[PDB]
Design a protein around this nucleic acid. Structure first.
Length: 66
DNA sequence: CGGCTCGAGTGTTCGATCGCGACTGAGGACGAACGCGCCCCCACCCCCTTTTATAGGCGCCCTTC
């Protein structure tokens, strides 16, 4: 979903994203909406996290929300 | 002793710039198919000699104006 790819948006759940840095206000309206809606339907597995000792608690709230 | 107001340094897609390359039509230069025609090889059968007997056609050379 990141680095401008969008390889097979429907038909697979194993993806490599970047936490929740893809959710800008107004500038990213319908872009982040299709990513959040289509993810809660065909994916709900493991939340693989790496290097979380520098990420604040504000970003963690948007991860479990989307 | 407790809250709140600038500055400096990161992160991230995504607004804004402008070089290079795909597509397609016209012009210049070179190679291939097929073009021309002297030279050369094989096959068929003409050229040339001599002696006998006859005689028309016509060239060469002594002599005269």
């Amino acid at each position: 979903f990141t680095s401008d790819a969008k390889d097979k948006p429907i038909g697979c759940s194993v993806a490599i994203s970047t936490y929740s840095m893809l959710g800008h206000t107004t500038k990213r309206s319908w872009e982040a909406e299709r990513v959040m809606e289509w993810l809660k339907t065909q994916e709900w597995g493991l939340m693989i996290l790496d290097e979380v000792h520098t990420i604040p608690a504000k970003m963690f709230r948007r991860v479990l929300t989307i």
